Amino acid sequence: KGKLSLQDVAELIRARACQRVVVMVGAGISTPSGIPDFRSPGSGLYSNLQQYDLPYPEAIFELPFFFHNPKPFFTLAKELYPGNYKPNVTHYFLRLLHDKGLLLRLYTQNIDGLERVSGIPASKLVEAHGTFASATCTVCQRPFPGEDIRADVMADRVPRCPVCTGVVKPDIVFFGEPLPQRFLLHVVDFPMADLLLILGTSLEVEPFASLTEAVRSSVPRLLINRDLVGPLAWHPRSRDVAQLGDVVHGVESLVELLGWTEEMRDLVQRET
Amino acid sequence: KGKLSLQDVAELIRARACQRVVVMVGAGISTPSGIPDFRSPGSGLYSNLQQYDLPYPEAIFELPFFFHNPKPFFTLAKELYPGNYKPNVTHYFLRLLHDKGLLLRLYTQNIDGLERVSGIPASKLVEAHGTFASATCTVCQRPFPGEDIRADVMADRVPRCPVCTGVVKPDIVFFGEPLPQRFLLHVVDFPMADLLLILGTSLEVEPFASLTEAVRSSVPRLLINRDLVGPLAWHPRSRDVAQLGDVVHGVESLVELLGWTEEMRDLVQRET
Amino acid sequence: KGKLSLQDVAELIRARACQRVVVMVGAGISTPSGIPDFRSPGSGLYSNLQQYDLPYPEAIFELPFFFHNPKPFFTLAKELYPGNYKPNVTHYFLRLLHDKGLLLRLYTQNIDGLERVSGIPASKLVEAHGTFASATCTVCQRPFPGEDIRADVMADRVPRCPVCTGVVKPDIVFFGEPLPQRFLLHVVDFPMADLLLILGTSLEVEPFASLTEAVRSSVPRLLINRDLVGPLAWHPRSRDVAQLGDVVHGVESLVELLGWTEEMRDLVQRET
Amino acid sequence: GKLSLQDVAELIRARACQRVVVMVGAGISTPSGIPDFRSPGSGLYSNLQQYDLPYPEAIFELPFFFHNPKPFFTLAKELYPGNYKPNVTHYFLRLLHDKGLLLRLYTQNIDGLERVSGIPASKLVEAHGTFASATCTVCQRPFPGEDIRADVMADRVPRCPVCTGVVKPDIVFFGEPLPQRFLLHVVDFPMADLLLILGTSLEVEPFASLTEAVRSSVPRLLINRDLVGPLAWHPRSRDVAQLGDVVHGVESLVELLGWTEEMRDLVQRET
Ligand SMILES: COC(=O)c1c(N)n(Cc2ccc(F)cc2)c2nc3ccccc3nc12
Ligand SMILES: COC(=O)c1c(N)n(Cc2ccc(F)cc2)c2nc3ccccc3nc12
Ligand SMILES: COC(=O)c1c(N)n(Cc2ccc(F)cc2)c2nc3ccccc3nc12
Ligand SMILES: COC(=O)c1c(N)n(Cc2ccc(F)cc2)c2nc3ccccc3nc12
Ligand SMILES: [Mg+2]
Ligand SMILES: [Mg+2]
Ligand SMILES: [Mg+2]
Ligand SMILES: [Zn+2]
Ligand SMILES: [Zn+2]
Ligand SMILES: [Zn+2]
Ligand SMILES: [Zn+2]
């Protein structure tokens, strides 16, 4: 019936009737910046991690495993460390969401840091999987210096804090660590949201997929990702719209439906 | 003075101060149903997994060992398939937590499926080590309901894919496979818990065992198990309680202090 | 018919058919002399190390932890340096095979030093986890007799070179150090041995646990432990003999089944 | 009449020594370019420390190998057959076998160069195993070491019967049952009339212990950068010690044997 297309969605934001946007982003926004992804067979990182004959492929994120075997995690680290990559039209669009005062929160499962590198502030972010921007000693459990354990990460060396080696670990959240207290914000963010935008994520690894259903039944869910997936696939609602297809072309056709094409082109030029 | 024992944890639940309870369970709640447990000797499943000389007991969850000889795995699978065994009091106790609206989520290392038989619904469950409810071809990767396979598995026959002849395996987690998609619901579940209950597990198979340290620091952690194990034995917290002894006996004393002895008897009778 | 019982074994030693007994012992032969154990739930030295924050009980043998806080490790040694505890029937029973000329070699995971104290010379021993006999500094690597650094451990100091003025340390094997030089004497011992005797050991830490299979398949394999463990639980041979029960009584029966009871009583008296 | 290198060379020339037992170590492979993981600041040593292993020899530990096989295959890559050639120490041992004087050559190297030098397998105890043979850890199917050599830039897992899993070169691991061929030592050493200890530290047993197994009348010649093991701690009256660079030492002894020109044509023809 009176259903929603991307046209309908753009003029909700133009008519500023949607002004509290909660955005969920996964790897479908960072693959077009050159980011390998460790869960894609045929990635240079997948093959080199596949080589580690690990138990589960995600043990690289497990603290007790890390204490006896740190080098696989650090194989992923230099593939994804900050300073080698650039944000794209996806990251910078979300910066425009913020600037125009429309962003409630950006939930990311990426760890490249290009949400913050694009100018979105820390207070608008939930970096669900942590950051490479700070690091801690595993022994003397204090440090911080972010890039600092860098160069070690370039040079295939396991970084060490000046007083107990200590395999100083980038602040990627590991199984067995206390989890981010900021993740508790989902409790109040997902009710408040007058709009759920799902960008370039397979809604495959929890809690991300469950969260798409925390939003009020009146709230629309717009999916810009190759294929409908997760609850949008299985439990769709009346206001669910999806631009199945390439994320980048996806965000440009939505950006051209808002009229931000120029602001963008300007911002990607200014920023870069 | 007012520190924490078995009475106090019952007092909190009856008073509904605890209403978001998170539970972890392992093998010790499956042994009282007569389940063999393949790891301790003197089990018939030992003398029967001796017809196949192996290096590890674990080697039965290793894809390359499966890729000659599925027979050691499939004699574990014949002994454990849904049918033979019946949920015991501890199961039904958990089912009563969900009946009375106290179960946030049940995390299990078991693969017998007696949490599902006891009537706890699937949405309440994270099956850490997979399930026999479903099957996928090792070559095709085509999915299969598990009863397509129970004819063959209940015949000392190796089930083959009808589309490509590849050997089909139950969706029991194997070394090298990505961890269950639902294991990450703990990011949301455990900081939301106001009580953590641990029943019948050694807390030695991670990432499962590290989940003990993901409830907030004030939240009590009740252990019902023979001995102190895992993070509860090296990082004990103030509000932890260790009811040490036979697993069934521990729960019976908790039900009595809860005052559920008749409601349990009844439910258990009607369910068997 | 002629399958092997603790009786049978004691006849081959009396008949001098087994004249090359290699022997493996672990913390289970040490315990009955009062040894506290660093990894047992609720003991003297266990709560000591637990007083500090360690993520592992095994971090005391971890070298970057020794460069942060060494006072854990040393207040273990302060409760294991020789003199404090006295050898028992197990130490002296292995003292008597040597005396009677039957011992090829004693292999031991123990560090309390009691095998030496019992009258077994250094060349009969292979000390897998090191010894409190010699010392060494942790910068220059200068050698020090154990007394040298024994003065200071009992003086609660942290012992330091005149060179580095840096913390010296007992030659207890630490993670990242190379395994004792004597460990590879097994390449000649075990194939030369006609009896393998395994005492009070969980057989859980490699490369110690692997020695069990280094004997020729002809060689009787005998375990005095509380329960059937390690490679004798999963890979038993035609000639393995399991005396399950307390280690001290298992020796005391065999000591009677060899009829050295009078010898043991007088060897012990004289040594005390 | 107390022994020096000229006299040992003389005992060989007269065939007064015809049953030579030889023990060799990483010092006869380092002149070929083979790194050596034990030697601090080598190539291997630094990359292996990137794996924070529980002890450095863990790379030959069999249950460690079923978890991270990488640190071992990291050693295998810089040691694998087909990157190096036998140097002059090998051909000198090959000249000793061709002259009918070698009783047995005992080696702790796994680089295979003794065999490439032409020494018969029957004169060889490879006390650490070999890379000429590889075994699937799951099905025990044998492979030529050259089957997996291509992968020896990451990690090998062939197909076979009970396989699809990690194929392990036959380096002897703690956990694998130890070489039956090594029992030859019980008779070779009591019967040697000369012991050549070439280019080994006697750091890793049983070799250090085996220097004592020759009869007290049998000279022990060490050609090695330094005095090591029971020769330093328990010297006998008939030990000679050519300390300094193994290749110079061997070339020196070859001069005293009158063999410099036969080694010429040999090394030349073999390379
Ligand atoms: C970019 O991926 C990451 O950094 C991940 C990461 N850090 N954990 C562990 C983790 C996340 C959140 C938490 F609260 C505690 C522990 C992950 N688990 C995964 C499980 C399945 C599939 C993909 C996964 N990816 C990650
Ligand atoms: C009935 O137990 C099961 O179903 C098991 C199962 N599926 N795996 C394999 C596995 C678990 C977690 C992972 F991340 C990857 C692969 C197991 N490993 C074990 C290891 C030691 C002791 C018991 C074990 N039990 C199981
Ligand atoms: C009192 O026992 C000891 O002296 C130990 C000792 N010295 N390490 C360190 C070690 C490092 C490398 C290596 F190859 C052998 C040993 C230990 N690890 C243990 C780990 C788990 C459980 C008990 C352990 N016990 C010891
Ligand atoms: C190139 O060195 C190797 O290949 C080694 C190797 N294969 N083992 C293990 C081993 C040898 C013989 C046996 F009968 C059973 C197991 C080693 N252990 C060492 C211990 C200390 C220092 C160096 C060592 N090196 C090796
Ligand atoms: Mg730091
Ligand atoms: Mg001093
Ligand atoms: Mg093959
Ligand atoms: Zn530190
Ligand atoms: Zn198939
Ligand atoms: Zn010093
Ligand atoms: Zn294979």
Author numbering:
A (entry chain D), B (entry chain A), C (entry chain C): 120 to 391
D (entry chain B): 121 to 391
Paper text:
Here, we report the identification of SKLB-11A, a SIRT3 activator with submicromolar affinity and high efficacy. In an effort to uncover the molecular interplay between SKLB-11A and SIRT3, we analyzed the structure of the SIRT3-SKLB-11A complex using X-ray crystallography at a resolution of 2.49 Å. The structural data revealed that the pyrrole ring of SKLB-11A inserts deeply into the cleft between two structural domains, where it forms a π-π stacking interaction with His248, a critical residue essential for deacetylase activity and conserved across the SIRT family (SIRT1–7). Furthermore, SKLB-11A formed a hydrogen bond with Val292 and tightly positioned between Phe180 and His248. Intriguingly, a significant conformational shift was observed in the side chain of Leu298, which deviated substantially from its orientation in previously reported SIRT3 structures. These findings suggest that SKLB-11A may modulate SIRT3 allosterically through an entirely novel mechanism. To further evaluate the functional consequences of side-chain reorientation, we substituted Leu298 with glycine. This mutation led to a marked reduction in enzymatic activity, as revealed by activity assays. Biochemical analysis further revealed a diminished binding affinity between SKLB-11A and the L298G mutant, with the dissociation constant increasing from 33.15 μM for the wild-type protein to 167.4 μM for the mutant. Collectively, these findings highlight the essential role of the Leu298 side chain in stabilizing the interaction between SKLB-11A and SIRT3 and preserving the enzyme’s deacetylase activity.
Sirtuin 3 (SIRT3), a pivotal mitochondrial deacetylase, plays a critical role in restoring mitochondrial function, particularly through the activation of autophagy. The human SIRT3 protein contains a mitochondrial targeting sequence (MTS), an unstructured region and a conserved enzymatic core, which includes an NAD+ binding domain and a metal-binding motif. Sirtuins share a similar deacylation mechanism, with residue H248 being essential for their catalytic activity. SIRT3 regulates mitochondrial function by deacetylating, and thereby activating, numerous mitochondrial proteins involved in energy metabolism, oxidative stress responses, and cellular respiration.
